[PDB]
């Protein structure tokens, strides 16, 4: 109880009470059978020829009762080899790394089929083999092929080479060539409509095979990089069900631009690269670690837009020739001028509207730049977090 | 082994076993004949009246077995004079500076001719003499003279004062005055064609003399600042061989704009200043230390371009009067608006196309600024790395 224990770490003395070290009986300093081999009987002390600045954090682990932390001048490779010597446990080591942030609990469980397991690693880890890389090399090239095929449909070398090459009317079958961007047929004479179709065969045979061989079946749809897989393949099928099921009149009066919405939503197939790029996931995590502080930006900009769109609207009010007809006209202008893009479509003209307009140039710097280095410090942190 | 050795560094006492210090027998603490003169027999210790915080890193060099590192509070001038006292070797000093980054292995071997050596330093080091500066003073001025001569060819005080001063047709001899920018002749009445020719005589007599006096002959073309030398002088010769060898008809149908490509590639003669500016090489190294992290920028922008070019194309779709004819038209617009240059050539007009268009102004800040301070921290690091 009152017995004081002198621990000598390479010439540095650390006297402690015996009931402090005996608080933790399974460590090297808590078990008397373990620390028996370090006792110097001529000096009545425990001599450890070990690192010197590491032990003040090891000593205060016992005094505070379990609160250890790394000293500022002791690196992570030196100090982690001291926790393993002093035997502070597998339990107080995990509390140490989480404070540190060296928290990598990734353990890929296989599907357990032993070929359902074996084929799973062929489609989850490119690093297992040469051909494991090849699928990743394929599927990265796959997405690009769809994109160029998607973008070229819009080109007026080819959308002017449509079924309505002159553009006079609108047919129910020409709705696909003008608002779905390809001509669906069992003959499939549309070349892009083939090339569009080819990639979807790859994506499902990625996905469905990845669905049947997943270990976790229920939490499959909480993983975000599986959601993008699903949203990719759908407007393909929405294209076909409009063609296959519908043999009727007056469908455009129900939903026609709703179809044109879907022709956009194809565009988020580009996010499928997230499974392959390490760097794109770091953006995916930086935003995941900034969803409140990003909201500082938008809300500070929403303040900035309204305050100056109005204030320029009334200094540009008394014109018959004003470039600013309303205030939600001037929401376009403010974001052209707080973000300092600056177009020239509409610019203030009056003497007051310039004085208002010039404050808004400064204030957009003072609105973007407040929560930007909040973000970029996270991104820099999440980038090198692999090291 | 069991024996303990007390080392006293200006009143601070470090105790270590004798078999720890005897692990490294050629140092001052490992050789008993060297440390004999520091022994205090009345206290049974080795007394060193030396720096106090330096020795904890010197002591842990012996305990860890060769892992030394500088303490955070001990400067580089103080701590490097302690490694020389404690005699940790020429071998563990080099491992120290590389961790430190004080790695300057530059040793210019001469060409060994003793005048082939001596003239080599006249064209590799401006600091050997006054005239050694003068060649650098000349050649820096040389490059500028070529550039002004290159730019003034394009001027419509002079390209409108061409052989086709009215511009009616195209001759085989007037192709040089209109697509090579000078009139080649043995008379050489074109003044620029002289001035162009004059600089190339300097560049080769730089380069070829630098080629014959190089010590390293095989690795001459791995050094990047020799490649720029080569690519400079070539379209000069491509000009002449087109004039000298060709006496025939119908050569423009084979390659004519390929000649016009070459008239550009003259422009990278400006990189020849890299041999002279210290600062331009720091750019050359910062990019050399960022070729993956720069690829974070382009790939994050390539994502940003495609996503918003499409999303504005469909919100600006249902106009007959739309400024956005296709999506690869709108790649031009996105980079005008993610980089916040902002031109006015084409701007969205619809209510949806502005709401799409205004997100892309914010998101270009959130795409450039993520890997920019990655780069600029390197450039700041490589700038002061000379100190």
Curated annotation (Swiss-Prot), chains A, B:
The keyword Transport applies. Changing residue 63 to A: Loss of channel activity. Residues 328-339, 340-347 dip into the membrane without crossing it. It is found in: Cell membrane; Membrane; Cell projection, Axon; Synapse. Inhibited by 4-aminopyridine (4-AP), dendrotoxin (DTX) and charybdotoxin (CTX), but not by tetraethylammonium (TEA). Inhibited by tityustoxin-K alpha (TsTX-Kalpha), a toxin that is highly specific for KCNA2. Inhibited by maurotoxin. Inhibited by kappaM conotoxins kappaM-RIIIJ and kappaM-RIIIK. Changing residue 16 to V: Abolishes interaction with KCNAB2 and strongly reduces cell surface expression. No effect phosphorylation in response to increased cAMP levels. This is Potassium voltage-gated channel subfamily A member 2. It comes from Rattus norvegicus (Rat). The gene is Kcna2. The chain holds residues 31 to 421 of 499 of the full protein.
